[PDB]
Design a protein around this ligand. Structure first.
Ligand SMILES: N#Cc1cc(Cl)ccc1O
Ligand SMILES: N#Cc1cc(Cl)ccc1O
Ligand SMILES: N#Cc1cc(Cl)ccc1O
Ligand SMILES: N#Cc1cc(Cl)ccc1O
Ligand SMILES: [Mg+2]
Length: 719
């Protein structure tokens, strides 16, 4: 083996070298003391990690039997509910409390805005996401379908003036709506000046300052004729670039060149469901990118660097600076998987979540400073490290994560509670015990959130034996999920999240449907979410519009003390009613789910890509993560289980959709087709396995199968 022995651990050389040569220097942590800490943390915490996974299996088996030994048509909720309490699935609700989490950056406690999630294994994307804190509104409007191509604003190889003009008008109305003038409209502005700590806007007729002068935040260049004017609204900045020289500014009545929005306030650098990392080499690539980001020297080759901070003149005089970069969280993997990056003496792989805490925590130290050996860029000015933890089931698993972070802080020599936690609410046993989960992390929690895919996957798997479930599309409006969304906001606010910690909602997946996003995604801040997930920097800029229209702080205040979801609502199983479906509707749903699986698995298994623009069955581009596999495979496993469809149906769908997916990947020079030799494609076989073995996977998790198939591919490719 190419391994290094440290106590009971045998560490992959690639990882040992990375940590010693790249991660450790500049941290003041003694290398041999670090590794001994790794050996000791792994040895101490592994058994409980194991015991927790065992508890999941034990609870699910009891729930499985419970549904099987039941022939009373509609389920008795009273009985079901007491049954869940009896087995310790539904724990008592704690007394009310407020979180004590301190040392938290302003982007999290206070500001409400868009949040990016990006695969850390892709340096270019990581870099763009980090630089996406400031983005052009003009770029976003012109380049997407928010401005229709009617009358006659079609895009083309060259600049369309008619289109640019609608871009301009759209932005002018946004300004009027956000930072209103005392009189008149920005549409008729002819110039901007700063006179006596105040913004002065020229109109043909008169001159006006702002309805609320407080919104004036700063400016660049001369107060005389500024190069830009900085506005603020709802905590978020707006920057009017004034430059009559530019090709856009030449046409503008006030010389305006662009409107720049503070967009991606925070960004999650992801080691989990948006990446494909199945061994030491993959983990090191990710860790190395996370390192370059924290040092601030990560640079990507097209033909590329992190942005510097932005310098302004305050309204009353004096220079100040605003961050040029999104504040970075890291999303570690959850409690389930092991990874061969480290094995013990007996050859057993080490828990990946435990490793992630150690290595991403170690690396994050660099982001708390700026130097020669450390790179010239900072992440947290309050001294915090921000880790999102996915896929936890209940408060014992939350407490275990907190204990893990405490032990890691010890090894790293960090103050206790440096490592803050974001609790993803994406498993049913967390949803119904959420107050307890927050309390378990009361001195660390900076974030909770919801999302469609994983949580619905868990919903299906948990009640697998209860009956056939409604269709995937129908799931988005089921009583359980609407109660889940509201209950998440209720819990966070009740725990005092407003002014302290983020309350997040899920990803907008339809990357090209930006008109639709702008029209509908406003529902999330309107529901009291201080953040929500966007699939790109362009989408972050556009989603930012919503936080200007909606006063999230005020919304949160109005919802205080409300109990909008009952536990009965949360526990309403999405069972289909009798005879819900025509045969062609059934076929459509099978094809849909088989296409989702094939389209995502083929890029994952063959190219190690876990996030990309994947055309769905109707050629709509979607940016989903691995959780798309979990929902899709569990639904099909469920329909198979209850005889909605046959094994022949599934196979035939798979064979139908495969050439389709092949066709959808024509642009890709590196692509290997699945059809017509289905049984020779590792990716096709993976897709089939996820479905046929779906019901048997722990909580419906796809990683054990997916990772195996990707390792199989890598090996075949090596020979
Ligand atoms: N898969 C899996 C698994 C692993 C451990 Cl260590 C315990 C229980 C499980 O289901
Ligand atoms: N072409 C073009 C274009 C136009 C505007 Cl108004 C903004 C960004 C662009 O790339
Ligand atoms: N930038 C960027 C980006 C890329 C992928 Cl593949 C996914 C999400 C993102 O924000
Ligand atoms: N859906 C979805 C989704 C996609 C990416 Cl790329 C990241 C996180 C998500 O929840
Ligand atoms: Mg998830």
């Amino acid at each position: 083996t190419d391994r290094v022995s440290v106590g009971n651990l045998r560490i992959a050389r690639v990882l040992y070298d990375f940590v010693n040569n790249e991660a450790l220097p500049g941290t003041d942590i003694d290398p041999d003391s670090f590794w001994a800490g790794v050996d000791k943390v792994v040895a101490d915490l592994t058994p409980q990690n194991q015991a927790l996974l065992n508890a999941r299996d034990e609870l699910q088996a009891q729930i499985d039997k419970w549904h099987r030994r039941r022939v009373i048509e509609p389920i008795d909720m009273d009985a079901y509910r007491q049954f869940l309490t009896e087995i310790g699935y539904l724990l008592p609700e704690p007394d009310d409390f407020t979180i004590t989490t301190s040392g938290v950056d302003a982007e999290i406690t206070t500001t409400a805005g868009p949040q990016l999630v990006v695969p850390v294994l892709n340096a270019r994307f990581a870099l763009n996401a980090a630089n996406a804190r400031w983005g052009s509104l003009y770029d976003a409007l012109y380049g997407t379908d928010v401005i229709p191509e009617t009358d006659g604003a079609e895009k083309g190889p060259t600049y369309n003036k008619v289109r640019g003009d609608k871009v301009i008008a759209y932005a002018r109305k946004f300004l009027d709506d956000s930072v209103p003038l005392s009189s008149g409209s920005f549409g008729d502005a002819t110039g901007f000046t700063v006179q006596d700590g105040q913004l002065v806007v020229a109109l043909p007729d008169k001159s006006t300052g702002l309805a609320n002068p407080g919104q004036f935040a700063g400016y660049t260049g001369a107060a005389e004729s500024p190069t830009s004017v900085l506005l603020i609204n709802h905590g978020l900045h707006i920057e009017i670039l004034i430059d009559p020289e530019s090709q856009v500014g030449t046409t503008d009545r006030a010389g305006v060149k662009d409107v720049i929005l503070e967009s991606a306030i925070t960004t999650i650098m992801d080691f989990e469901d948006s990446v494909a990392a199945v061994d030491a080499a993959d983990k090191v690539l990710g860790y190395r990118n996370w390192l370059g980001l924290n040092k601030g020297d990560l640079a990507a080759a097209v033909d590329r660097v992190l942005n510097r901070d932005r310098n302004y003149t305050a309204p009353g005089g004096g220079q100040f600076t605003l961050p040029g970069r999104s504040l970075m969280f890291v999303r570690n993997v959850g409690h389930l998987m092991t990874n061969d990056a480290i094995v013990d003496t007996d050859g057993s792989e080490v828990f990946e979540g435990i490793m992630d805490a150690l290595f991403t925590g170690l690396i994050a130290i660099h982001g708390l400073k700026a130097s020669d050996v450390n790179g010239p860029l900072i992440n947290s000015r309050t001294g915090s490290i921000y880790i999102v933890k996915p896929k936890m089931h209940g408060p014992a698993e939350v407490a275990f994560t907190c204990e893990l972070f405490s032990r890691v802080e010890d090894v790293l020599g960090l103050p206790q509670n440096t490592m803050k936690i974001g609790i993803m609410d994406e498993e049913r046993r967390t949803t119904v015990n959420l107050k307890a989960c927050i309390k378990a992390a009361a001195d660390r929690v900076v974030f909770i959130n919801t999302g469609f895919l994983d949580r619905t996957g868990d919903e299906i798997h948990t009640s697998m034996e209860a009956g056939p479930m409604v269709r995937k599309g129908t799931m988005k409006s089921q009583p359980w999920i609407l109660a889940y969304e509201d209950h998440n906001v209720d819990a966070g606010l009740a725990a005092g999240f407003s002014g302290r910690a983020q309350v997040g909602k899920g990803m907008w997946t339809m990357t090209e449907l930006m008109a639709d996003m702008v029209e509908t995604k406003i529902a999330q801040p309107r529901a009291g979410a201080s953040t929500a997930w966007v699939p790109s920097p362009t989408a972050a800029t556009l989603h930012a519009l919503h936080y200007h229209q909606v006063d999230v702080a005020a919304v949160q205040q109005g919802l205080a003390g409300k109990r909008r979801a009952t536990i009965e609502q949360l526990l309403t199983i999405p069972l289909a009613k009798e005879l819900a479906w025509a045969p062609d509707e059934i076929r459509e749903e099978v094809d849909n789910n088989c296409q989702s699986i094939l389209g995502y698995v083929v890029r994952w298994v063959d190219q190690g890509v876990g996030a990309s623009k994947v055309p769905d069955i109707h050629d709509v581009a979607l940016m989903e993560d691995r959780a798309t596999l979990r929902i899709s495979s569990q639904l099909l496993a469920n329909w198979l289980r209850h005889g909605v469809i046959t094994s022949a149906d599934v196979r035939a769908s798979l064979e139908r959709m495969a050439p389709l997916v092949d066709r959808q990947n024509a642009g890709d020079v590196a692509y290997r087709p699945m059809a017509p030799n289905f049984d020779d494609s590792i990716a096709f076989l993976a897709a089939q396995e996820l479905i046929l073995s779906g019901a048997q996977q722990p909580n419906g998790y796809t990683e054990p199968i997916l990772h195996r198939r990707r390792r199989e591919f890598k090996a075949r490719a090596a020979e």
